[PDB]
């Protein structure tokens, strides 16, 4: 059988990067915004092989009516934010969760914190301090996830591949 994943979150959040990191174990050297890309890998669970159809969407504002045409029969959603962009974290609640709720209500969704390698980075922790802000903690995120009302919160670095597989491992579990 097929599993149909759909990945959503603000632009830059590096949604494209997350996917490619996992699927191909390569990081994209160039930033490019996604319109719509469809990658299909194969996963074997308990000896049973499943085509995992991944849907990379636009995190941009322009494609609000073009993006959700990708949603019919979605078995699960990743709802994503950069742990170093409290705006993108805010837009979980505001834009993203509502959107997918409507189109697909009974459909599950995990909360995902991205680019966690940049937490202790001084320069990004500097960039945020210049708007008197700071990095999102797991304590925080996992309150939102429980409340919102996800399957769970997960977090990862597409770069270091820390916690990456697990996100996708839990999604599958969630889907199946």
């Amino acid at each position: 059988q097929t599993i149909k994943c759909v990945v959503v979150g603000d632009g830059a959040v590096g949604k494209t990067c997350l996917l490619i990191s996992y699927t191909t174990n390569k990081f994209p050297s160039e930033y490019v915004p996604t319109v719509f890309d469809n990658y299909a890998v194969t996963v074997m669970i308990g000896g049973e092989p499943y085509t995992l159809g991944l849907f990379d969407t636009a995190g941009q504002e322009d494609y609000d009516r073009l993006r959700p045409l990708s949603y019919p029969q979605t078995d699960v959603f990743l709802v994503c934010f950069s742990v170093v962009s409290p705006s993108s974290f805010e837009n979980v609640k505001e834009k993203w969760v509502p959107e997918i709720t409507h189109h697909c209500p009974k459909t599950p969704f995990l909360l995902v914190g991205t680019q966690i390698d940049l937490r202790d980075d001084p320069s990004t922790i500097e960039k945020l301090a210049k708007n008197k802000q700071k990095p999102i903690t797991p304590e925080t995120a996992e309150k939102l996830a429980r409340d919102l009302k996800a399957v769970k919160y997960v977090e990862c670095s597409a770069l270091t591949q820390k916690g990456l597989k697990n996100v996708f491992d839990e999604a599958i579990l969630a889907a199946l």
Binding site: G46, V151, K152, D169, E170, L173, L176
Partner: protein, 291 residues
């Protein structure tokens, strides 16, 4: 690449060299979920031992191989199958342990209804083990009849330690989705953090096996069963008119959805039911060679 780093770690933890040096007659007996089990013969005595062989490249989570060594080595108990030794043979971890001629409980439960004396004997033996493991913050994680093994003389040992984890003051729960689907506690399937209690739930399932011949929702495919366990009320036995209050009441303490109200191993040790436990001999009729 990470292979080499892992193989190296392992080398330092095992006993050096090869056991083909002192054992003849390796023959496969069954599989686990992690690797095959052979029988073998100590050349100088002709004594029988069993040997678990596990390839490092075939593990879903290699790290778990460290429990095979650490568990048997440090948690030697009367009701825990004795590991004598472990070794690296090329890309395989080989653990040499005692040979349990009685076989596993799975064979007995799918072919015969055991009476409450024999059952109580079993749960007694396993809880003696789990008390002691949990006392040190060690969760087994894969309790089912398959994981229980017998001696010729009716004695009972717990084994299949490959899925075990450790908790402590510092890391008090775990989170990995680990175990066999039908025996899994509801909180673990639900993806919440959990402790040793998961084992007691699974023992409650194994009591159901012992009584009714298989676990709840056996006919379903695993992932449907997982859902039902998670979403539903604790499964009850199918014929209560035949079961004593002692045992029903015992089991109502294992199969509790909330883990905080579910009984601990030490609590269960003091439970009237376990005082029906027959001697090891009362079991020996259940073994295949006898039936």
């Amino acid at each position: 690449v990470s292979h080499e780093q892992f193989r190296a770690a392992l080398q330092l933890v095992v006993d050096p060299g090869d056991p083909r040096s002192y054992l003849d007659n390796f023959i496969k007996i069954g599989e686990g979920s992690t690797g095959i089990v052979c029988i073998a013969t100590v050349r100088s005595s002709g004594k029988l031992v069993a040997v678990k062989k596990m390839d490092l490249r075939k593990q879903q989570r290699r790290e778990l191989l460290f429990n095979e060594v650490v568990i048997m080595r440090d948690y030697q108990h009367e009701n825990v199958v004795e590991m004598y030794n472990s070794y690296l043979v090329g890309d395989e971890l080989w653990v040499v342990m005692e040979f349990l001629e009685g076989g596993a409980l799975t064979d007995i439960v799918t072919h015969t209804r055991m009476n409450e004396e024999q059952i109580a004997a079993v749960c007694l033996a396993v809880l003696q083990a789990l008390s002691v493991l949990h006392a040190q913050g060690v969760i087994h994680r894969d309790i089912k009849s398959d994981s229980i093994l017998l001696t010729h003389d009716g004695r009972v040992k717990l084994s299949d330690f490959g899925f075990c984890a450790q908790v402590s003051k510092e890391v008090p729960r775990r989170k990995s989705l680990v175990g066999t689907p039908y025996w899994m506690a509801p909180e673990l399937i639900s993806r919440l953090p959990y402790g040793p209690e998961v084992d007691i739930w699974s023992l409650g399932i194994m009591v159901i096996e012992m009584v009714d011949g298989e676990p709840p929702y056996f006919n379903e495919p695993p992932l449907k069963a997982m859902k039902m366990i998670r979403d539903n009320l604790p499964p009850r036995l199918k014929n209560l008119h035949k079961v004593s209050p002692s045992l029903k009441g015992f089991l109502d303490r294992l199969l509790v959805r909330d883990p905080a109200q579910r009984a601990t191993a030490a609590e269960l040790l003091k439970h009237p039911f376990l005082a029906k436990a027959g001697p090891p001999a009362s079991i020996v009729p259940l073994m295949r060679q006898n039936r």
